[PDB]
């Protein structure tokens, strides 16, 4: 008669322990990455000032803006003049 009790107890505790573990693993993965918040806003403004990772509100198909630098920029860069 004890196996049902022992079973339900171990199932309950096994689910509970894992949730903390899945939580503790996420927290530790956060803790391997520690940086300065002063430079985070600077990076966000740098990638922000030009519309890099945000879609333009005035965007129409045929817009030259893409997440990649695109043909005009790659041909107008230093690669187009240092190939000689």
């Amino acid at each position: 008669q004890l196996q049902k009790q022992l079973k339900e107890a171990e199932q309950i505790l096994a689910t509970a322990v894992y949730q903390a573990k899945e939580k503790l693993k996420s927290i530790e993965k956060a803790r391997k990455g520690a940086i300065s918040s002063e430079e985070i806003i600077k990076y966000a403004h740098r990638i922000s000032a030009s519309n890099a990772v945000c879609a333009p509100l005035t965007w129409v198909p045929g817009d030259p803006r893409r997440p990649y630098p695109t043909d005009l920029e790659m041909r107008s860069g230093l690669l187009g003049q240092m190939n000689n």
Partner: protein, 145 residues
């Protein structure tokens, strides 16, 4: 003059974590095969399997008279010294799962009434293993059938 956004989640999961995870992941799985389990992960799965197998055995009629039970490496290792040995694995937990056979073998040997070469040819041992897996399907009894 106007500035549309800062997108702090993107900055925080690119800066702190050196990747760009916020992307539709269909491009990865369809194009590239899923990565194999890490060494550390393998140890964890084995520990869980031993506990589950023990339960399946006990709440059911089982024979310890001529059998041997092995809980090592999540493998059954159920063998009889006289004639044969078998090693198993059960993927399922509480839900009933048909017994799965990893390997079936015969322990009887005589060189001389053969000739230098073992009693059964591996084709037949492949044949016998599938037949067992067939009776088990019904799964009325875990170890008596």
């Amino acid at each position: 003059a106007r500035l549309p956004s800062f997108a702090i989640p993107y900055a925080i999961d690119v800066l702190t974590t050196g990747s760009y995870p916020r992307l539709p992941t269909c491009i990865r799985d369809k194009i590239i095969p899923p990565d194999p389990i890490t060494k550390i992960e393998k140890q964890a799965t084995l520990h869980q399997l031993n506990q589950i197998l023990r339960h399946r055995l006990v709440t059911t009629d089982l024979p310890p008279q001529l059998a041997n039970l092995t809980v090592a490496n999540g493998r059954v290792k159920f063998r009889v010294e006289g004639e044969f040995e078998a090693t198993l694995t059960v993927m399922g937990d509480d839900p009933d799962v048909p017994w799965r056979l990893l390997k079936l073998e015969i322990l009887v040997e005589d060189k001389e009434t053969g000739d230098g070469r073992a009693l059964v040819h591996s084709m037949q041992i492949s044949f016998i293993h599938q037949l067992v897996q067939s009776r088990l399907f019904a799964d009325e009894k875990p170890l008596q059938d």
